Design a protein around this ligand. Structure first.
Ligand code: HEM
Ligand SMILES: *[C@@H]1O[C@H](CO)[C@@H](O[C@@H]2O[C@H](CO)[C@@H](O[C@@H]3O[C@H](CO)[C@@H](O)[C@H](O)[C@@H]3O)[C@H](O)[C@H]2NC(C)=O)[C@H](O)[C@H]1NC(C)=O
Ligand SMILES: *[C@@H]1O[C@H](CO)[C@@H](O[C@@H]2O[C@H](CO)[C@@H](O[C@H]3O[C@H](CO)[C@@H](O)[C@H](O)[C@@H]3O)[C@H](O)[C@H]2NC(C)=O)[C@H](O)[C@H]1NC(C)=O
Ligand SMILES: *[C@@H]1O[C@H](CO)[C@@H](O[C@@H]2O[C@H](CO)[C@@H](O[C@H]3O[C@H](CO)[C@@H](O)[C@H](O)[C@@H]3O)[C@H](O)[C@H]2NC(C)=O)[C@H](O)[C@H]1NC(C)=O
Ligand SMILES: *[C@@H]1O[C@H](CO)[C@@H](O[C@@H]2O[C@H](CO)[C@@H](O)[C@H](O)[C@H]2NC(C)=O)[C@H](O)[C@H]1NC(C)=O
Ligand SMILES: [Ca+2]
Length: 595
């Protein structure tokens, strides 16, 4: 191979070798090999990178060059022809709450993040992309095909920059380009506590010995907290409503303010940390703040794991769950916990569950106001609707009462995500998330749909007749191939999401596999998975078995009517009950006595 020890990590980090707490950066989880699963490292590769120069140039970069004898189809075209649909009627999920879509993006944000490239503190190359669509170094533009309404309106392309890579950041030239995972790989509530030591500190209230997370000093939501503002200008959140002046929130994960519902659950989490930290200083008055913070951060992680694996995953993989995530058997130090590259494209299945509108219900779960239901696009980096229009209570009820959008072969990604996405750097509400995933698949060097089919031991459709067989849909299989010319070339994201859904789950054969084994590895290769003997005392686990997101809401809001099973479609009021019916997380077990 090229080099066993490359990498520009958060230098200098030695293992406390017996401390009952995870490191903020993920180091020292695995004793034998320390950086396994730590942040700011190359995503893991399950199959060899497929680049045009076999080395780092994306398929679709030069245009005399082909992929298996054919030209790859323009990202935006695959979008226009396959992804979009017009009639939003009937795409809702009869059995999944918006929360279902919402949790997915939290976990995800906890497990991976491949940043973009800058190396420009005061650039014009940033501009050559934006204004000229000049494909060159770190700029890999998304051109618009013939007859795209976006030409008459936006220009010739949608600016797009390549993800960040390893050994350096500047040009570079050796072993197949690998992308960076800026966040730790373990399900450990990092979107909340940060991945860099530097940032993890700034988020804490080190002004008092209480292990509390720093909160907003400028605004309150009925006496309850909000995250603090990211007082860095220029801010996206500000730009969307000049008059309002309300900046983005600041959490352990930078994508925290991308959309209104996501900030909401970020708040509920920040809120739960401090509540835990307080319940613990009432119980263990002698604890210093560091033990508070840590102890709390430990419960929280346990929280995100139990919810994710007990309640979320089973309705995602369905009949395919046990085939991939068999019951726990203990820590396996020989398992690579690292998040793979393809995983970051397989978990995107979620983009197809985002409905076109966000609602705010009042206390009777009735429409809240004259502008209760809003277009999803007016909510990207919209923080001012939280702070200045109800707080998070109205939105938390939308999550529990409203449904998620169901993945459909003829209605894939809502046009609010595929025609009007707002990207923090740019100004217009005209990006296409469908095209973006597709250029990114290519940016990361993903091998085609068939290699993955194979990788997972599934039939490798080579023909129209075969593809048809796999998708149970003659028309999609035909549009697919008229564009790709061969099933070997279909991009993992679109090919993956096009399959029908396995039984009782929400994703098909190939994604069940991909998602299936990643989660199996991060659970089996985490020295701190809550069930692994040693991490939590027997008694402590017995209360942790009782957490529920519904409780998370009850203890951290003023919603008082909640469903018992928040991930499935519940109606109001038949399915809602009083918070008192919801079991609480008893922390007595954390009580520590001196003598
Ligand atoms: C309205 C809701 C959502 C919006 C507006 C949104 C937006 C975005 C955007 C703009 C990107 C950057 C893509 C790129 O540059 O390559 C992204 C990436 C991603 N999204 Fe979505 N997303 C949403 C929901 C979800 C959901 C529900 C899931 C999963 C269940 C999900 C999973 C992912 C993953 C895994 C990435 C790449 C993360 C990384 O490796 O950096 N997203 N999203
Ligand atoms: C930018 O953000 C500001 C929020 O700071 C938005 O201003 C708000 O606009 C509405 C009018 O459409 C004001 O509400 C009105 O008064 C009461 C509600 O308080 C209601 O009974 C009326 O029917 C009407 O809704 C609201 O008070 C006002 N906020 C202030 C003080 O400026 C503005 O609409 C946003 N504009 C953009 C650029 O999207
Ligand atoms: C809407 O989604 C609900 C969430 O999955 C689902 O509830 C599920 O109900 C079935 C009832 O059979 C449970 O499945 C298990 O049922 C028994 C256990 O008593 C077993 O013998 C079966 O083999 C099976 O494993 C699920 O546990 C339960 N889901 C959860 C996690 O609460 C509803 O059935 C769905 N409603 C519709 C409209 O189909
Ligand atoms: C860091 O932690 C500090 C202590 O936990 C916290 O100080 C306390 O902040 C709360 C809310 O800002 C204040 O509580 C209430 O004070 C009066 C009560 O008479 C109310 O009228 C106010 O509206 C407010 O809600 C406390 O006064 C304050 N306590 C102390 C010790 O001064 C800081 O706010 C925290 N800072 C950060 C960045 O999180
Ligand atoms: C830990 O998990 C690993 C990987 O899944 C298991 O290793 C297997 O070990 C057998 C020999 O005992 C080898 O033939 C394979 O290379 C491994 N299987 C695979 C597919 O990786 C191991 O069984 C687990 N360790 C323990 C003690 O539970
Ligand atoms: Ca993590």
């Amino acid at each position: 191979s090229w080099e066993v020890g490359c990498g520009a990590p958060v230098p200098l980090v030695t293992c406390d070798e017996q401390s009952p707490y995870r490191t903020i950066t993920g180091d020292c989880n695995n004793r034998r090999s320390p950086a396994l699963g730590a942040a700011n490292r190359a995503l893991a590769r399950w199959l060899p990178a497929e680049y045009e120069d076999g080395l780092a140039v994306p398929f679709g970069w030069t245009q005399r060059k082909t992929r298996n004898g054919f030209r790859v189809p323009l990202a935006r075209e695959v979008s226009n022809k396959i992804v979009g649909y017009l009639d939003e009627e009937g795409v809702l999920d009869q059995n999944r709450s918006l929360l279902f879509m919402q949790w997915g993006q939290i976990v995800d944000h906890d497990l991976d993040f491949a940043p973009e490239t800058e190396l420009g503190s005061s650039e014009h190359s940033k501009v050559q992309c934006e204004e000229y669509c000049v494909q060159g170094d770190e700029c890999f533009p998304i051109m618009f095909p013939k007859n795209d309404p976006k030409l008459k309106t936006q220009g010739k392309c949608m600016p797009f920059f390549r993800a960040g890579f390893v050994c350096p950041t500047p040009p570079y030239q050796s072993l197949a380009r690998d992308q960076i995972n800026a966040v730790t790989s373990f399900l450990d509530a990092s979107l909340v506590y940060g991945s860099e030591p530097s940032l993890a500190s700034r988020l804490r209230n080190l002004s008092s010995p209480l292990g509390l997370m720093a909160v907003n000093q400028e605004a309150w939501d009925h006496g309850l907290a909000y995250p603090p503002f990211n007082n860095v200008k220029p801010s996206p959140c500000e730009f969307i409503n000049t008059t309002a002046h309300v900046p983005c929130f600041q959490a352990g994960d930078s994508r925290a303010s991308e959309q209104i519902l996501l900030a909401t659950v970020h708040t509920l989490l920040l809120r739960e940390h401090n509540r835990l930290a307080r319940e613990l200083k009432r119980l263990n008055p002698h604890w210093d703040g560091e033990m508070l913070y840590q102890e709390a951060r430990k419960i929280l992680g346990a929280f995100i794991q139990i919810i994710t694996f007990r309640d979320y995953l089973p309705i995602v993989l369905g009949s395919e769950m046990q085939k991939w995530i068999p019951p726990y058997q203990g820590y396996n130090n020989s398992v690579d916990p690292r998040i793979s590259n393809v995983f970051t494209f397989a978990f995107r299945f979620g983009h197809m569950e985002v409905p076109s509108t966000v609602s705010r219900l009042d206390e009777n779960y009735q429409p809240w106001g004259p502008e209760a239901e809003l277009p999803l696009h007016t909510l990207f980096f919209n923080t001012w609707r939280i702070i200045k229009d109800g707080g998070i209570d109205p939105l938390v009820r939308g999550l529990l009462a409203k449904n998620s959008k169901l993945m459909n072969q003829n209605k894939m990604v809502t046009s609010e995500l595929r025609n009007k996405l707002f990207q923090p750097t740019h100004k217009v509400h005209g990006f296409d998330l469908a095209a973006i995933n597709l250029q990114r698949c290519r940016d990361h060097g993903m091998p085609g749909y068939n290699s993955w089919r194979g990788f997972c031991g599934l039939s490798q459709p080579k023909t129209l007749k075969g593809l048809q067989a796999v998708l149970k849909n003659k028309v999609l299989a035909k549009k697919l191939l008229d564009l790709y010319k061969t099933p070997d070339n279909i991009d993992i994201w679109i090919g993956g999401n096009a399959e029908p859904m396995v039984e009782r789950g929400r994703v098909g054969p190939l994604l069940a596999c991909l998602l299936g084994r990643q989660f199996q590895q991060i659970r089996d290769g985490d020295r701190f998975w809550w069930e692994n003997p040693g991490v939590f005392t027997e008694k402590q686990r017995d209360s942790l078995q009782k957490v529920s997101f519904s409780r998370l809401i009850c203890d951290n809001t003023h919603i008082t009517k909640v469903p018992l099973h928040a991930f499935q479609a519940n109606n109001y009021p038949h399915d809602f009950v009083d918070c008192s019916a919801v079991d609480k997380l008893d922390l007595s077990p954390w009580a520590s006595r001196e003598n």
